[PDB]
Design a protein around this ligand. Structure first.
Ligand SMILES: Cc1cc2nc3c(=O)[nH]c(=O)nc-3n(C[C@H](O)[C@H](O)[C@H](O)COP(=O)(O)OP(=O)(O)OC[C@H]3O[C@@H](n4cnc5c(N)ncnc54)[C@H](O)[C@@H]3O)c2cc1C
Ligand SMILES: *[C@@H]1O[C@H](CO)[C@@H](O)[C@H](O)[C@H]1NC(C)=O
Ligand SMILES: *[C@@H]1O[C@H](CO)[C@@H](O)[C@H](O)[C@H]1NC(C)=O
Ligand SMILES: *[C@@H]1O[C@H](CO)[C@@H](O)[C@H](O)[C@H]1NC(C)=O
Ligand SMILES: *[C@@H]1O[C@H](CO)[C@@H](O)[C@H](O)[C@H]1NC(C)=O
Ligand SMILES: *[C@@H]1O[C@H](CO)[C@@H](O)[C@H](O)[C@H]1NC(C)=O
Ligand SMILES: *[C@@H]1O[C@H](CO)[C@@H](O)[C@H](O)[C@H]1NC(C)=O
Ligand SMILES: CC1(C)OCc2cc(C=O)ccc2O1
Length: 515
């Protein structure tokens, strides 16, 4: 952990090569175009720029425009803020009826998230069947961590929860570790010890400023193809609504890094997707693939909220309780009168009047899946439909049962006993905001009725379905996808670490292949 970042201001040096998409001089040929300046997109573009001319296209603006994105304290503000179409948080509702958000900003979801940093479960690599260069994976983790990851300071609530998890039998004590392993640990954070947010945008600082150009408020509308099927370029619109073209040249490539929602949307809009679905919308099929926008996953979040009789200190999540069937954390939260959109699954949820502990469990996988479909066959700014089918798979429900029973165990610990309003023997001694924990039937109803998004959604452009083991779109030359659309299961409890790593790792695979 010699390599970890220090406390330091958010580094915006890269703004020297960030331009408004209104600049027509950006139009032309590049070696690489990366669509979406997010978690995977930024480190991929920075890596490619070491040797090649790169255009990164991001639909959102720069984080300096929304200062509440740059601190731990600002986290709530971004979810409370109304979505006017320009804000870094884009609000949506799944067809399941569950409120949710995605990022719309340079840096992607790393600019709005809860900061928790972990490496992938070391078993993930062989699970995929991809021939990963495991030494390069680990060096690439250190390259991310060196830039943006700290060892968090002590926070009283995280220490309480950590003692609780251990007392509740989530063993062993792993101390401070970045690794996803069974047991309780302090993990890394992309919030520094001063509360400054560090994010994927800062990895642009590792790019070559002579080779990397970033266009912001660049809404990529279509992938352009040859007339040997190859991606050749993009159409993108600017904030005034004027259109622009950029192309790749020679052995160059287009990479889509537009996220679980944005990637399948743009593939479908560009005629890459299920023949009968695109034909039904009169979208000309460039490449039939029955799986674009299929196998879209949202790991369930289930939770209780306790209202201690004495104030607790607010904390960022740093302490994790990991089993193979559930991943658990808790945030301590200040009261608010404006709700944090998607913290609770609907807008009709009680407001807290005092500090509360949000105590949560995450279902692994999950095994339930749904799909992304177009709402508009022409306009990328119109959000696609998304459905996750929470708990349609009974293994997911069985796992939520186990998780909720373990949160029961946690509330019974000596660790949590001081946070009860009444010194009675049972967990009815706590005061709850919303529904308290309840044989399995009542745990099942609790799981089904009170599910929220963990925000760790993934899928829609899966390796083995749409992509090969090199992240290439099967049947198309010069087109890759690198982002959370690529895997049907989580790499770990907190996937930003994996997707930051993946952007640079695939960039290095691209540079090697080209040698
Ligand atoms: C509120 C919240 C909290 C979270 N907390 C954590 C946590 O603490 N730790 C953790 O590990 N994970 C966390 N996650 C999950 C994790 O951050 C995400 O899974 C991950 O960042 C996704 O990376 P991505 O590259 O797939 O997408 P993104 O990072 O969202 O990148 C996609 C980018 O593409 C852009 N875009 C989309 N369509 C287009 C288009 N057509 N043209 C141009 N640009 C486009 C978007 O604006 C965006 O910037 C959280 C998620 C949320 C929503
Ligand atoms: C780009 O320029 C337009 C005016 O042409 C302006 O409205 C918009 O805010 C600018 N966006 C950025 C990111 O500078
Ligand atoms: C990669 O790092 C992990 C710790 O994150 C370690 O368990 C593993 O042995 C390393 N693998 C290789 C091939 O070095
Ligand atoms: C597609 O176009 C045909 C005309 O060629 C029309 O009959 C059909 O209704 C159209 N479908 C859609 C969904 O636009
Ligand atoms: C790590 O990954 C493998 C799935 O490949 C799994 O068998 C194991 O449960 C996972 N462990 C944890 C603690 O998530
Ligand atoms: C577009 O979005 C709304 C959800 O807000 C939905 O009711 C409507 O039917 C959608 N249109 C299509 C074609 O899916
Ligand atoms: C759940 O998931 C697996 C696919 O992984 C499948 O075998 C099983 O049939 C599904 N279960 C239910 C209850 O649908
Ligand atoms: C938003 C708030 C209140 O603080 C951060 C937070 C983070 C996780 C991530 O594992 C889950 C829940 C949560 O709650």
């Amino acid at each position: 952990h010699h390599h970890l970042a220090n406390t330091s201001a958010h580094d915006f040096s890269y703004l020297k090569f960030v331009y408004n998409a209104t600049d027509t001089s950006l139009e032309g040929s590049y070696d690489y175009i990366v669509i979406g300046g997010g978690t995977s997109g930024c480190p991929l573009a920075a890596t490619l720029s070491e040797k090649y001319k790169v255009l990164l296209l991001e639909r959102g603006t720069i984080a300096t425009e929304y200062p509440n994105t740059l601190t731990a304290d600002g986290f709530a503000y971004n979810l409370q803020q109304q979505d006017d179409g320009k804000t870094p948080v884009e609000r949506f509702v799944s067809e399941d009826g569950i409120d949710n958000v995605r990022a719309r900003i340079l840096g992607g979801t790393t600019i709005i998230n809860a900061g928790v940093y972990a490496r992938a479960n070391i078993s993930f690599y062989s699970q995929t069947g991809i021939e990963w260069d495991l030494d390069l994976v680990n060096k690439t983790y250190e390259w991310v961590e060196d830039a943006i990851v700290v060892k968090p300071n002590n926070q009283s609530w995280q220490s309480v929860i950590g003692e609780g998890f251990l007392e509740a039998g989530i063993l062993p004590d792993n101390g401070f570790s970045l690794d996803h392993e069974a047991g309780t640990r302090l993990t890394g954070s992309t919030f520094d010890n001063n509360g400054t947010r560090h994010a994927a945008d800062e990895l642009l600082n590792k790019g070559d400023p002579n080779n990397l150009l970033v266009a912001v408020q660049a809404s990529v509308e279509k992938i352009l193809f040859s007339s040997n099927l190859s991606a050749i370029g993009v159409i993108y619109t600017d904030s005034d609504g004027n259109s622009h073209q950029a192309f790749v040249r020679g052995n160059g490539e287009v990479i889509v890094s537009a996220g679980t929602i944005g990637t399948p949307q743009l593939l479908l809009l560009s005629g890459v997707g299920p023949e009968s679905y695109l034909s039904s919308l009169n979208i000309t099929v460039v490449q039939p693939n029955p799986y674009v926008g299929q196998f879209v996953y949202d790991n369930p979040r289930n939770f209780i909220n306790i209202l201690p009789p004495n104030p607790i200190e607010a904390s960022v999540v740093t302490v994790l309780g990991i089993r193979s069937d559930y991943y658990q954390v808790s945030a301590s939260v200040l009261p608010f009168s404006t709700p944090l959109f998607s913290l609770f699954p609907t807008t009709s949820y009680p407001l807290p009047n005092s500090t509360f502990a949000h105590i949560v469990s995450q279902v692994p996988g999950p095994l339930s899946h749904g799909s992304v479909t177009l709402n508009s066959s022409s306009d990328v700014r119109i959000a696609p439909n998304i459905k996750f089918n929470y708990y349609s798979n009974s293994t997911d429900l069985a796992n939520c049962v186990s998780g909720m029973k373990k949160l029961g165990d946690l509330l019974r610990t000596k660790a949590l006993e001081p946070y009860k309003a009444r010194d009675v023997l049972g967990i009815d001694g706590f005061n709850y905001l919303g529904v308290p924990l309840p044989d399995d039937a009542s745990f099942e109803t609790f799981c089904l009725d009170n599910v929220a998004s963990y925000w760790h959604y993934h899928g829609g452009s899966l390796v083995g379905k749409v992509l090969d083991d090199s992240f290439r779109v099967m049947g198309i030359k010069a087109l890759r996808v690198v982002d959370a659309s690529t895997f049907p299961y989580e790499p770990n409890s907190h996937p930003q670490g994996f997707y930051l790593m993946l952007g640079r790792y695939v960039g290095l695979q691209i540079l090697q292949e080209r040698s």
